[PDB]
Write a protein that binds this ligand. Structure first.
Ligand SMILES: NC(=O)c1ccc[n+]([C@@H]2O[C@H](COP(=O)([O-])OP(=O)(O)OC[C@H]3O[C@@H](n4cnc5c(N)ncnc54)[C@H](O)[C@@H]3O)[C@@H](O)[C@H]2O)c1
Ligand SMILES: NC(=O)c1ccc[n+]([C@@H]2O[C@H](COP(=O)([O-])OP(=O)(O)OC[C@H]3O[C@@H](n4cnc5c(N)ncnc54)[C@H](O)[C@@H]3O)[C@@H](O)[C@H]2O)c1
Lengths: 236, 236
């Protein structure tokens, strides 16, 4: 399988090795910084290579800048910076493109688990709340950093809070979000969901990636699930 | 989109109605019992009808009897009675058929969540335990009914505990299982997972389906997630 990588940071570096290690072939790697045998600097160079799928592990802006071009080029897209879709108009436009091109956009499960159950019961969800606890240093302050809706959070926290965006897309609800800055060495996400289906609680304590403590290692791993599902018979 | 349903019980009856209220078309319904306009009694009658995917919501035996034929007919299969895959040989042959035909077998998340995160971090799982609490009546008594591996659980409880089989498939580990019979009126599943990625806890308090108290409403819904994903450009 031919895979193109957009973003060669903490997640991209990991994925590049994972691909080479798991029999995958790297078509190209797009990034403004960094070095690699398959590295390119512009989306045009990137799209000249034939590839079965492209993985976005760069930023929300990258999704907005490249998503449509990649899909129109006949390539499916795995997205990690799902926060880009917090913009309803963009999300709709992207869904429109998929419709006409027959292309697909895969939402990586990212730094949490349980998206499967949540999407399954979306029609019957009555209440869903996300509480995130991460190291205060980035916020330069400890305590409750934000408490409100995911849409509002997206406004005051661009290029971050992708989990909230993904949960909103999966549930079809404007997820309640509470962001906490604490003296924690792990990235913690806790989700509570209630509805006609019953109740479910999900708690994830993520080990941060060395190259970027802001990103949960599980988020990089979530991409490998999708890549494996594309290649194998049994899909989970 | 055309969908073939195998099994017309609690889940199948729900799905037949769901399909028609959501823009899908019923290609056929296979069950040894029951009545419906598109009902058929044999797998051969079933496979003569054009369909984009087949849903198994019948029994483990149905998966073993029909799986290979369906994939061979050029039809992908969504599986709910995942316990059939406890049969390592059958699982192997199914994987073998998928390779050649290029067909897919979708493992429904069923009555639990987190398979996404579990499969994602499958290479880094050190411990995974499932704790299930069900109504005691079917057991004839209350208390801890079983403690051991998922494989031995499958032996002591044939045609049951598919959630344990699903977890084993996703994690690649023979999950530790503990079953308790209580006065509770719904199936409560708790999953503990620990590894280099960090830790994850999932708890799901389900609601039993009226047509079959032993089945969790969420399990029926878990199939709608896969159907929607198949039909949509955006895959959650
Ligand atoms: N959905 C989730 O659960 C989840 C979890 C963690 C991280 N993420 C997302 O994935 C990305 C974080 O990844 P990381 O930890 O790899 O970040 P990183 O900062 O370590 O690396 C990002 C790389 O992308 C490059 N980049 C950014 N925009 C680009 C563009 N438009 N074109 C080319 N290259 C570009 C940067 O130069 C950098 O090298 C973040 O945007 C974050 O939004 C999502
Ligand atoms: N993966 C999960 O989380 C999960 C959860 C609940 C149920 N399940 C599975 O799904 C099925 C139970 O679903 P339900 O509640 O719909 O059961 P149900 O007993 O209400 O209905 C099952 C239907 O399947 C039919 N059937 C069984 N084997 C058949 C065969 N070989 N050919 C044709 N028809 C056949 C039956 O006659 C019945 O009408 C069970 O096998 C259970 O093993 C899985």
């Amino acid at each position: 399988m031919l895979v193109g990588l957009i973003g060669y940071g903490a997640i991209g570096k990991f994925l590049a090795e994972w691909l080479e290690r798991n029999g995958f072939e790297i078509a190209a790697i797009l990034d403004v910084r960094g070095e690699h045998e398959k590295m390119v600097r512009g989306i045009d160079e990137f799209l000249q290579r034939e590839m079965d799928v492209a993985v976005e592990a760069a930023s929300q802006q990258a999704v907005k800048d490249y998503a449509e071009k990649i899909l129109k080029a006949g390539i499916d897209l795995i997205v990690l910076s799902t926060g880009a879709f917090a913009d309803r108009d963009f999300l709709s436009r992207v869904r429109e493109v998929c419709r006409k091109t027959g292309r697909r956009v895969y939402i990586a499960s990212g730094a949490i688990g349980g998206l499967d159950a949540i999407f399954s019961a979306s029609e019957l969800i009555e209440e869903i709340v996300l509480t995130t606890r991460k190291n205060w240093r980035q916020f330069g302050r400890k305590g409750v950093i934000f408490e409100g809706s995911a849409s509002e959070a997206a406004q005051k926290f661009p290029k971050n809070l992708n989990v909230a965006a993904t949960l909103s897309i999966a549930s079809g609800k404007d997820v309640k979000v509470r962001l906490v800055a604490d003296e924690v060495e792990e990235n913690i996400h806790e989700i509570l969901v209630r509805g006609e289906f019953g109740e479910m609680e999900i708690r994830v304590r993520n080990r941060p990636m060395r190259e970027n403590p802001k990103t949960s290692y599980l988020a990089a791993l979530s991409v490998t699930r999708i890549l494996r599902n594309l290649k194998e018979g049994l899909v989970v």
